[PDB]
Amino acid sequence: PQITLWKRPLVTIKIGGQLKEALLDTGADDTVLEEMNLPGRWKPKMIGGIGGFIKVRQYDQILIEICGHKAIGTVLVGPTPVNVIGRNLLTQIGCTLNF
Amino acid sequence: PQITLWKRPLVTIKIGGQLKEALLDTGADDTVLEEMNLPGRWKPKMIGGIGGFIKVRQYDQILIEICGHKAIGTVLVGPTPVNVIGRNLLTQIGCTLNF
Ligand SMILES: CCC(CC)CN(C[C@@H](O)[C@H](Cc1ccccc1)NC(=O)O[C@H]1CO[C@H]2OCC[C@H]21)S(=O)(=O)c1ccc([C@@H](O)CO)cc1
């Protein structure tokens, strides 16, 4: 679809069989979701931005369906302020900015 | 223009005749610029990043030119590592997300 930006670009995602709401975030290199259980092994990672860094659990090659489009990639899980879909997955669903 | 997300969506902006590089960031409600000594009145503000909050100065009615489109609105100035153009200005230039 084409999504305008008068509202936060929040969309429903499906990950680990669970539905969640996440923000399409072109300013995020990476996808970061709030704490949750996901199957498979994870590695501890640090991710940083404004304010500094947080500790996250890195899950690789995770299926995630974003507004009906499938992606398989890295998902970071931790105490993020907001569920954000970053460019690592936005590229997979073919998302571009246009004006 | 169409901007893919293989790399950070950095564009040149003009603010006060000064040219800067900034992210087109659908994840930011408002525009956040690196420290710059703008004249005029401002009001204090706190914004929450992935690593916690920082203090910024809110300037209103600031003109920013983005790829031939002029936008005017709120700009937050503070110790951010990156210039980000937020939805408050992206909407004015007709920017959408598309997939
Ligand atoms: C996830 C944080 C989101 C939460 C919605 C909020 N931020 C936007 C987000 O795009 C941010 C931009 C960015 C900041 C620093 C360095 C590089 C990019 N990128 C980001 O942190 O990404 C993480 C994850 O991937 C990594 O790559 C880049 C860093 C890693 S913000 O800048 O802190 C912010 C907060 C409040 C407001 C107010 O206006 C109200 O919205 C406006 C803007």
CB A3 within 8 A of CB A24: yes
Q: Is A26 within 8 Å of B87 when comparing Cβ atoms?
A: no
Written as six digits, the tokens of A23 are 């923000």
Q: Residue A91 burial (CB < 10 Å; 0-12/13-18/19+)?
A: middle
- Name the β-bridge partners of A71: A64
Domain boundaries of chain B, sorted by first residue? 1-99
Q: Is A80 within 8 Å of B50 when comparing Cβ atoms?
A: yes
Give all strands (DSSP E) within B4-85, no chain letters.
10-15, 18-24, 31-34, 43-49, 52-66, 69-78, 84-85
Minimum Cα–Cα distance from B80: chain A residue: A50
Range list of H helices, A1-99? 87-90
B79 lines ligand 1 (CB under 6 A): no
Instruction: Report the gap between the CA of A60 and the closest CA in chain B (Å).
Output: 19
**Experimental method, per PDB record:** X-ray
- Name the β-bridge partners of B3: A97
Distance CA A90, CA A83 (A): 14
